[model samples]
Target: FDPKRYARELWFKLQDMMNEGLGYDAVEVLNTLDENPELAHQKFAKVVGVSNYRYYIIQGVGEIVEIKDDGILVKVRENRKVPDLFLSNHIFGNGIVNATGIAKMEDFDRIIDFNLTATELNKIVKEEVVNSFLKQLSKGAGSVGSLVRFIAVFTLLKDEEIKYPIEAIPLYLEIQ
Candidate 1:
């Protein structure tokens, strides 16, 4: 699945909320799964079919190991020892690590046994990334300002993908 399409939908929603803050009503609100869960499955399945979507849940280190062509690649460890999936490749971050704690909580075996739903996969990545970045934040490491940029980054993960508060949200930071 072209994860980018999902990201686009999220961007639109956030933009709408922002615009609403500026005195405007959002004309169109998107219901991610409600509108079309099949598309999500199709998109994710296609990506998995073409790319490597392995993960390592050993000791609670859930990392994506592969990606399809033209997808973002992140280095889980130095020397590419166990390359995790890039933070931006799929709808991972949105699901896993939001304010609540973690989403799509699964293990390596589970990932292999079950089809990683968009919601589940997204939560894993999102939760982990948020924790990693939050660790950096707590330590005063990795610019905190980058958090906003990171939010935007999460929102615009793929070319056309999007998320929702109900679907997935990063609750670490409460932007009031």
Candidate 2:
């Protein structure tokens, strides 16, 4: 599959889900998935088209409270939390490509083809999304007071207990 081409079409669906508030909050999914991710998968998450890979698509607007080596802690304006969720600075893996809930393994002839789709998506994110000014932010040379609107994906893997930063890869990001 021509990922670069397919991505153009995929963006429409991704953007619609984001604008319509279809994706859940990272914490919202975590609250339930953390208890039993497998059991909650269908209710709280989506599978990658017959693949075991899964993710919980998420969307939110928050201030960049703190920037870390691996991710940025975002503080939401509602309900009461200093910094609720974390967005990864170093976006990687299949969390995103599998996130849109559009790409299907059956579309591609090989499993590698399905996985490589993420490689291309990551390229655009680095080249277009983060490359804008996030590059500076990542290096500790930019201001951190801006508001960030993001649509991201996760594997329900992060928690304070594990010491893993629990970074979500942003599929779409806007700094305002």
Candidate 3:
């Protein structure tokens, strides 16, 4: 895990930075999110803002023949590309809300329930599924094997083709 590697580094940094009675305010950094790590993958268009690609808005219905195993199965229907979120049988909106008139005054569109999101699953696949499998395959090869494979696979996806406005570069890099 990332925070585990930070243990020795963070130990000294935090200790020196957070010394009590120091002129600067002390900070306590927590590693809860990194304790048990995972992957989070996204639709290329949504992530990269690619104009050529359409956001699939997956409803997770029907069967697919391809086995990319990214929890996303890509297919072309009637010449239009489709992406399935590939989340299992559970419908996204089932029993997942508590409404209050007061809270409703706030923007309902901005709210996201953590329990319903596939973010964790996506994370698991990226960190464990793709990386692990590729790593194993890359063994006995040079260090660049898995990295090259990642680039090759990533390039095959739609989002890799987009050109973004310069202003968004910082935000995109933050995601990287």
Candidate 4:
């Protein structure tokens, strides 16, 4: 929601440099800011590196939990410590490949087939089940792969509850 806050912070950090007449490419800054909308809530950061190289702050997750009224209410069994940092690797291909793979994988078939209301889902699927899925997904995968797998899991886990029922559909006179 507050996606621009990051660029704002970065602006503050670079304010002195800008005033000192240090040259900057607006296109590059905007491009960097554009990379973060999806990462807004994840508390990730983009750290500049030599030349065009970059790095990111990372978080560890053992499970992903989504509450309908809110988004990603909790990531169960999370490791909050500073993760080992690494340079960004632009090794293989475009993100389209990964996105397409997730769409085609049918990995969350059980979750899809279950098809229950939010309250019902909360009743049947506890933190344990969700964490189990997360563990399974990240078992053999690398960091980015695990992240992609987590997102895939979340794709199925999303929208399980009524977030703003009153706002979405106003109620009439009170009954019981």
Taking all chains together, each candidate's TM-score versus the true structure is 0.22, 0.68, 0.21, 0.17
Candidate 4 lDDT by residue in tens digits, 5-63: 43243334333433343322222322333454333212322222222222221212212
Q: Candidate 4: give the clashing pairs.
A: none
- Who is ahead in TM-score, 2 or 3? 2
Give the candidate number with the greatest lDDT: 2
- The lDDT, on a scale of 0 to 1, for candidate 4 is 0.24
Name model 4 segments beyond 4 Å from true: 1-118, 125-129, 142-176
Candidate number with the higher TM-score (2 or 4): 2
In terms of TM-score, the best-performing candidate is: 2
lDDT by residue (45-146, candidate 1, tens digit) is: 112123232111111111223322322233323343333223342354323222112222242245422333345444543555444454544565433123
When summed lDDT is taken over every stretch of 10 residues in candidate 3, the lowest stretch is 166-175
How would you order the candidates by lDDT, starting with the best?
Answer: 2, 1, 4, 3
RMSD of each: 17.9, 4.5, 20.3, 21.9
- Which ten contiguous residues of candidate 4 have the minimum total lDDT? 166-175
Please provide, for model 3 over 80-156, each residue's C-alpha lDDT reduced to its tens digit, 9 standing for 90 to 100: 23331122212122111110011121322333422223233233334543445434434643221111111101111
Per-residue C-alpha lDDT of model 2 across residues 70-164, encoded as one tens digit per residue = 56777654554446666764767666666665666677888787667766666666566555546767666545777877777767532324223
The 10-residue segment of model 2 with minimum total lDDT is 157-166
